[PDB]
Amino acid sequence: LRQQNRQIISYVPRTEPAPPEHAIKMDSFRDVWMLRGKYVAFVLMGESFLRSPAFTVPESAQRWANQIRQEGE
Amino acid sequence: DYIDESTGELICAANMELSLDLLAKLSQSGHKRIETLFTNDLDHGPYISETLRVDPTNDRLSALVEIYRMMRPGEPPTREAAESLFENLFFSEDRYDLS
Amino acid sequence: RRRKLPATIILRALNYTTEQILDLFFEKVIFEIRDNKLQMELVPERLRGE
Amino acid sequence: REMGTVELLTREGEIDIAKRIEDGINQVQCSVAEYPEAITYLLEQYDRVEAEEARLSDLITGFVPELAREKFAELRAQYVVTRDTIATAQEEILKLSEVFKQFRLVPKQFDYLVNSMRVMMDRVRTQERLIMKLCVEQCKMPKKNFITLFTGNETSDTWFNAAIAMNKPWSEKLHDVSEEVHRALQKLQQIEEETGLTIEQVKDINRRMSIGEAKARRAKKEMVEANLRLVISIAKKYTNRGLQFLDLIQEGNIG
């Protein structure tokens, strides 16, 4: 029989992520934010925030958000 | 840091940049109160946040391991040895005097 | 006078978490979510020198 | 770091290592007592002691002095009847070895027996390597055939005429080194006559005692590696007496 030795403690780096860029601009469209692809897909009604299905073309998302905001009080 | 109530996932960790996608994600999970840090560019410099970002340690144990490695390079760290070294460094009356 | 380490290492070794460190070394501003959801409190002395 | 890579023992491990050491020592003692040259050297040393050329102190380290003299006389009688009983020789050699093991000799005497055994086995193996070099590395005769016709005989012309007269184009060209083959055979015969025994049993004893020595060395190394910590702890207290800590711990390791 033997006796157990003291354990050796180690650790790992935190590997901090990279911040996003979020290069955006509001000229006249009000729905022309630039994130990726569709680039905008934003809508906010009521006390909570809801996520759009991210229509790739800007006009479709724009008028869908408009017609949603008109019917959504 | 804010965690989800359904799956218990970490929606956003402490001391990270907040963006549109992040706020949308943490607001679709049912959060109503959000607090940030008030930092200026000439009066309240955010050097603590930058130091935390640079810092690769995770917890007390990682900090103790790093301190032990810095103090005694080439020696395998031990929990008890590192704790004793930290206690004796500045919190021991036999080795520290502030008359 | 040994090799320099980040100043947060000793603070973490003092049994202090990231949230407590941020609380101690920074001020807190609360952002609400009412209609508009963009209605943060405004302390008057926070609009000086910027 | 190197010292802490290993872990200290317990009482049960110490008992097990001591038992292993005792078993290896007993095996080595049996292997070295099974030879008659040990008895021959014992009798020669006893005769030199009786001839006013030495002392009784370095003859036997106690017992396991008229009793010692009568035991030596009995050992001499057993050896002479063993040499006079050349199918009973093996049994009488075993009895002589048991009686020898019943005697507590001197470590220097045991080392002399061990190195004489090493000398004789080295001579035998040198002759064997000469034998294999004279035809395997010179006549270029086959490996498996060599093994088959050489395993066991090692004395006759089984490896001499077969390697030459086997109708291969490279076989009949070394009657010049046939003379060296005969000389090696004569040397082996002289060594065998001097020893009074065979060769395979000698090799068996040699590798058995080698295994025992290796086991004892492994156990001693384990004990030393376990007690390095105690050595350091004892050497801690003399660090300021004109000697270096490394020197002190090395001396402690030797102790």
Curated annotation (Swiss-Prot), chain B:
Domain of life of the organism encoding this protein: Bacteria
Coiled-coil ranges from the UniProt annotation: none
Post-translational modification note: Acetylated on several lysine residues in the presence of glucose.
Complex and partners: The RNAP catalytic core consists of 2 alpha, 1 beta, 1 beta' and 1 omega subunit. When a sigma factor is associated with the core the holoenzyme is formed, which can initiate transcription. The rRNA transcription and antitermination complex (rrnTAC) consists of RNAP, NusA, NusB, NusE (rpsJ), NusG, SubB, ribosomal protein S4, DNA and precursor rRNA; S4 is more flexible than other subunits. In pull-down experiments interacts with CedA. (Microbial infection) Interacts (via flap domain) with Escherichia phage lambda antitermination protein Q; this interaction renders bacterial RNAP resistant to transcription pausing and allows it to read through termination signals.
UniProt function note: DNA-dependent RNA polymerase (RNAP) catalyzes the transcription of DNA into RNA using the four ribonucleoside triphosphates as substrates. Resistance to the antibiotics salinamide A, salinamide B, rifampicin, streptolydigin, CBR703, myxopyronin, and lipiarmycin can result from mutations in this protein.
Family note: Belongs to the RNA polymerase beta chain family.
Protein name, UniProt field: DNA-directed RNA polymerase subunit beta
Species assigned in the record: Escherichia coli (strain K12)
Covered range of the whole protein: 300 to 398 of 1342
